[PDB]
Amino acid sequence: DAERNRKRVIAAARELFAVHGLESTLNEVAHHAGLGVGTVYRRFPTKEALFEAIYVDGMDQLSGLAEAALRHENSWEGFEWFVHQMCEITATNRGLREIAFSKAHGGDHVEAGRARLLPLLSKVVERAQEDGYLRPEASATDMPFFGVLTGAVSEFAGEVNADLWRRYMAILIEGMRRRDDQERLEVDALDEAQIDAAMT
Amino acid sequence: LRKDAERNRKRVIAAARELFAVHGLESTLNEVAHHAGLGVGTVYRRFPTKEALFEAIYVDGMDQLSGLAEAALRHENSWEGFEWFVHQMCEITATNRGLREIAFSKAHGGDHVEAGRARLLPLLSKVVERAQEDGYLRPEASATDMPFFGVLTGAVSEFAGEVNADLWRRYMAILIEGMRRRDDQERLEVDALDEAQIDAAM
């Protein structure tokens, strides 16, 4: 029962985030969710508590998408499909983009969410590389930067050009495909330690 | 007087760009003057506000980018010239968080800004078109892709931090690889912005 209201607050907050960024108060989230103000406060005493819950919820969402991508028949199509689904979340919602990348997070819940997501990202990259589709320099830590890159397009271009991020996402994915005439990427992706220290 | 005023202008801009790499846009007008070895009154009369200093830096930055495109067109190979130019362009904002904020987070207008953009844009088109006509660069590419290469590589440095100061070069190389013309590639479904669109976005 309380878990149902918890999901409704998160879903209502993500809807408001696409238009209002992070400016919406807990009262406005409660109205949009159709819940009493005390119900949102009993679930999330502060906005930072709501912000962290949305971040962890977004990671759990990426995990389910990565698990679905690993069920696809072709590992390259699974990789491209996952990148599409991942980047769309933050490229079309400036509030989520601010939480995902322009925010530092920590604590037990955040660590447990990253612990589930990071190995799934590794398996998606590993499978496409083993079948010869994805270039061998690729890493699981390239995935967050695909989200950062596509989100920065929408942040700069604005809502008038709301689809422009798809152009540069397609360019990025094409640059990741393995070709014979490709030079080794001189700068390696961040390792597990570096990507951890970057977003905390 | 024109030779001396031009020297003090380049002095202030170079000192501001050097401070902005470390402090972002937090450096004050007085700190810029001390770093330039110029009197506070001289810099203050030239730039009474931080916003005036940001516009002169931005206009100077487009002039620097115009010179880089000019040099790139003198390279013997059109693809190496395109690669070299994109590297030189992105390095400006990918290694200086203050310049990155001025280039893509501030709004810019006025006669000097419009005149600078009008000289830069056809030079960007010539670098792109040369590599396209040789069969290296994919036909969908446009001059208006160039500012987004700066935005994209800049967001890498913004997210990764100064401890990972070279990471932007990795994703730049990925972007450049994805711009190659291929006999078999799917056409980019979303077109680059036109001049009217990229002027409104800036």
Author numbering:
A (entry chain A): 14 to 213
B (entry chain B): 11 to 212
Give passages from the manuscript.
MAB_4384 belongs to the type I class TetR family of regulators, characterized by a divergent orientation to one of the adjacent target genes. These proteins possess a conserved helix-turn-helix (HTH) signature at the N-terminal of the DNA-binding domain as well as a ligand binding domain (LBD) located at the C-terminal part.
The crystal structure of the native protein was subsequently solved with the partial model obtained from the SAD data and refined to a resolution of 1.9 Å. The asymmetric unit contains two subunits. Analysis of the crystal packing using the PISA server predicted the existence of a stable homodimer formed within the crystal, consistent with other TetR regulators and with the SEC profile of MAB_4384 in solution. The DBD is composed of three α-helices α1: residues 12–33, α2: 39–46, and α3: 50–56, where helices 2 and 3 form a helix-turn-helix (HTH) motif. The LBD is made of seven α-helices, α4: 60–82, α5: 88–104, α6: 107–114, α7: 121–143, α8: 155–170, α9: 178–188, and α10: 205–211. The surface of dimerization of about 1,700 Å2 is mediated by 31 residues mainly from helices α8 and α9 of each subunit and involves numerous interactions notably five salt bridges, fourteen hydrogen bonds and van der Waals interactions. Interestingly, we noticed the presence of extra electron density in the LBD of chain B in a rather hydrophobic pocket. From these results it can be inferred that the DBDs of MAB_4384 are too far from each other to bind to the DNA groove. These observations combined with the presence of an unidentified ligand in the LBD strongly suggest that the MAB_4384 structure is in an open conformation.
